[PDB]
Design a protein around this ligand. Structure first.
Ligand code: HAS
Ligand code: HEM
Ligand code: CUA
Ligand SMILES: [Cu+]
Lengths: 33, 552, 166
């Protein structure tokens, strides 16, 4: 058949879970600069 | 099962020994998890095990066993036994047993001082902290054994290549090969650090060692080493898990690519541990930083290859729409569950490491409880769960002693509890780390020092209970799997559940380039000279050896 | 089936990487950025700067705690700190506010860690080498110090105070 969404799904949570974590520490980074 | 796969026997010993170490080491897990909850349960431990002198004797033992000994022994098992089974070849049995003894006699020597409060320096053993001569010599013999594991597997490879002139390296073996090579280049740091320094010192032959060069050489290795811990899981996850999941490994080329990239990018990234070090150029730090983001790539690749396989699996197991396929998988089988929940904890473990990895952003968290929080999702969760939840297909395959219903459900408990229990620790530890609680400290012996972390200290208390239970339920498991006097008239000649690997045309072109293992190994070596070359050469001309100290 | 899913895997495994790479590049672009700005002061100095730990507090800048702080620019003060088995000298370190404080730190025994709770001053201190770092305390008050590299049995109890006067 076709497209692997469950994969795309997972590599989504992942991609957001990255962001939060990163961008998030970037915050605290400046808050402390 | 013995005199036609004595490769089975010798493989089993790397596992058993592997698992002894893990037990003895994890004992301290609870007391430390409780410590980061401001509960001081060390008076107990100390009374229960009378040899323990300090919290830090336990940290040493925890780290040195769970992360140097259990891992290396598990790696050695999977990364020799799996390739040997695919090729259906017996590895050089001398050199296979040499190795084993090399790790045993290694471990016994190293433990002698460790257990005697004579080397309480932690698994990083940073100079000028100066341990007993037998701890350095010990760890040294323990590591060099991996060099025989290299030779042995390179040989299997050579031999298969001889009887298939032209043909492409089969999958599991290609994986195991780039792995051993990558570990060989990686191991050179610590082997050098030993031979040129820690041994000389510890014996008496010199009186000083240079902290910057030592922690530098050392880190050229202790990043690769975590990839060394992971890949044997990664092997299992790509080439065995797909089968038990009900589906197929959906790509051979990505599996190789992903592994290649590890060969390429695992070694030149150690200034990711030295971001807070003096006497190392910002230019070179920022360089290593980027190549560290570059090493996220394989693991990112993997998520999608693996996610794909397990969706496929699902779509076959009788799956459904957006989510359904997850419900569908063999959730009553500890061997599927363990490494899947593993991957689950890996998702956030990875977003720690990218944050970790990124220079300026690393002084938010370096040496806080975040790093333990980070790595526990990596190595104590996934790598360990995979290892754990794999006794259930590998141990029957190594003894011909089948697994019951009682044990299959015992496992399922051990597994689900080791998972959430870790998960919970990882909320606490990440959270305390943000709130600036440091790693490596007996902080429950300063009750008032961190009042503003009351909340996550609950999690850390809770983890330590949950996870104590888990561990004992595990020892219960492991010993039952292995002592029941049951022996099957056939299942030992019922091999590893290797997976069907989707493939076709375009693969040949892409696969062939990757099967150029000499060329990529050479690139890798060159990469390393570039990255550590100018820094090393600079330090070595400007050596500043300081005397040693025992502060325990 | 079967092969209708050996192309279509690769298809979006490409697409994923384009996105993996662009993204990691944005990080690289945002990290690159912090280099250009003030926050970069906390990156140690790259230049080797060797000393002798067995003398360090009995001659040169690390000898007397009452000398730790020297004026060095039009708005700049250098502070020569000492991390040592289970303490920091001076204790407390006294510094002015809103002035570019330039710490020079070393140890006489083992490695310790120098971590100014509330800021990014998170530098590893190493025997024989000198850890140079630059920060400006914009908001005054009492800042605590934690040794966050294990240094022996009194590690849990190794704290300092930074005193930013105004
Ligand atoms: C085995 C253990 C190792 C794993 C591997 C690991 C992964 C990474 N780490 Fe790390 N690490 C760092 C950077 C990384 C990066 C970039 C990665 C990458 O490998 C991350 C890659 C992972 C991903 C990109 C996530 C992929 C997600 C997957 C693959 C899950 C898929 C899930 C599915 C498919 C679900 C399917 C099922 C369903 C039901 C849906 C840095 C900084 O650059 C530090 C320094 C901190 C400091 O200041 O000292 C660090 C600190 C440590 C330490 C402390 C060492 C010490 O004692 O000083 C250890 C032991 C460690 C281990 C490990 N680390 N790390
Ligand atoms: C019983 C489950 C476990 C618990 C409850 C536990 C708990 C902990 C805690 C709280 C720490 C941090 C203590 C500190 O900051 O000094 C720690 C350290 C560590 N743990 Fe675990 N752990 C467990 C299992 C494991 C396993 C299986 C591994 C390896 C595969 C592992 C690897 C490590 C490493 C590498 C450190 C760093 C030690 C150091 O800083 O020298 N842990 N453990
Ligand atoms: Cu000084 Cu820990
Ligand atoms: Cu690393």
């Amino acid at each position: 058949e076709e497209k692997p969404k469950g994969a795309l799904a997972v590599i989504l949570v992942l991609t957001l879970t990255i962001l939060v974590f990163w961008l998030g520490v970037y915050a605290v980074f400046f808050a402390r600069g | 099962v013995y005199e036609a796969y004595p490769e089975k026997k010798a493989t089993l010993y790397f596992l058993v020994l592997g698992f002894l170490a893990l037990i003895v080491g994890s004992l301290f897990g609870p007391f430390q998890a409780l410590n980061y909850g401001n509960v001081d349960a060390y008076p107990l431990l100390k009374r229960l095990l009378p040899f323990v002198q300090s919290y830090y004797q336990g940290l040493t033992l925890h780290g040195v066993l769970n992360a140097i000994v259990f891992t290396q022994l598990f790696a050695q098992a999977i990364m020799v036994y799996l390739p040997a089974r695919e090729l259906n070849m017996r590895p050089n049995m001398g050199l296979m047993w040499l190795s084993w003894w090399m790790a045993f006699i290694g471990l016994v020597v190293a433990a002698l001082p460790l257990l005697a409060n004579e080397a309480t320096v932690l698994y990083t053993f940073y100079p000028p902290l100066k341990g007993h001569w037998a701890f350095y010599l010990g760890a040294s013999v323990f590591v060099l054994s991996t060099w025989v594991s290299i030779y042995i597997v390179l040989d299997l490879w050579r031999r298969w290549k001889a009887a298939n002139p032209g043909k492409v390296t089969p999958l599991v073996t290609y994986m195991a090969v780039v792995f051993w090579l990558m570990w060989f280049l990686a191991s050179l740091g610590l082997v050098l650090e030993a031979v040129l320094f820690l041994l000389p010192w510890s014996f008496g032959l010199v009186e000083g060692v240079d902290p910057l060069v030592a922690r530098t050489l050392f880190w050229w290795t202790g990043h690769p080493i975590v990839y060394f811990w992971l890949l044997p899981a990664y092997a299992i996850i790509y080439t065995i898990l797909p089968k038990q999941a009900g589906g197929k490994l959906v790509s051979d080329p990505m599996a190789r690519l992903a592994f290649l990239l590890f060969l390429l990018l695992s070694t030149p990234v150690g200034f990711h541990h030295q971001f807070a070090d003096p006497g190392i150029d910002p230019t070179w730090k920022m360089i290593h930083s980027v190549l560290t983001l570059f090493v996220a790539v394989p693991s990112l690749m993997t998520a999608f290859t693996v996610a794909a396989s397990l969706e496929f699996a699902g779509r076959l197991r009788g799956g459904r729409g957006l989510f359904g396929w997850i419900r569908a998988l063999p959730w009553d089988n500890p061997a599927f569950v363990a490494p899947v929940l593993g991957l689950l904890g890996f998702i956030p473990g990875g977003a720690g490491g990218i944050v970790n990895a990124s220079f300026t952003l690393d002084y938010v968290v370096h040496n806080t409880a975040w790093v333990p929080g980070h790595f526990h999702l990596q190595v104590a969760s996934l790598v360990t769960l995979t290892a754990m939840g794999s006794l259930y297909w590998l141990l029957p395959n190594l003894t011909g002693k089948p697994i019951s219903d009682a044990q299959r459900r015992l496992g399922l408990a051990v597994v689900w509890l080791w998972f959430l229990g870790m998960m919970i620790m990882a909320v606490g530890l990440h959270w305390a780390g943000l709130l600036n609680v440091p790693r490596r400290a007996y902080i429950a012996q300063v009750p008032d020092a961190y009042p503003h972390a009351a909340v996550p200290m609950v999690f850390n208390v809770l983890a330590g209970i949950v996870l104590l239970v888990a561990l004992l339920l595990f020892i219960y498991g492991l010993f039952s799997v292995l002592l029941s006097r049951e022996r099957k008239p056939e299942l030992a000649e019922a091999p590893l559940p290797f997976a069907e690997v989707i493939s076709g045309p375009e693969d040949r072109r892409l696969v062939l380039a990757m099967d150029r293992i000499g060329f990529w190994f050479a690139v890798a070596a060159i990469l390393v000279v570039l990255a550590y070359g100018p820094t090393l050469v600079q330090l070595f001309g400007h050596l500043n050896p300081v005397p040693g100290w025992r502060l325990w | 089936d079967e092969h209708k899913a050996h192309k279509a895997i690769l298809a979006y495994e490409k697409g994923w990487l384009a996105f993996s790479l662009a993204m990691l590049f944005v990080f690289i672009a945002l990290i690159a950025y912090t280099l250009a700005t003030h926050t970069a002061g906390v990156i140690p100095a790259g230049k080797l700067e060797r000393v002798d730990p067995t003398t360090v507090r009995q001659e040169g800048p690390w000898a007397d705690p009452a000398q730790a702080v020297v004026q060095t620019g039009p708005n700049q003060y250098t502070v020569y700190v000492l991390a040592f088995a289970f303490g920091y000298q001076p204790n407390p370190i006294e510094v002015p506010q809103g002035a570019e404080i330039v710490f020079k730190i070393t140890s006489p025994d083992v490695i310790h860690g120098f971590h100014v709770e509330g800021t990014n001053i998170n530098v590893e201190v190493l025997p024989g080498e000198v850890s140079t770092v630059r920060y400006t305390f914009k908001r005054p008050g009492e800042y605590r110090i934690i040794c966050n590299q294990y240094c022996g049995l009194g590690h849990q109890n190794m704290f300092g105070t930074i005193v930013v006067k105004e």
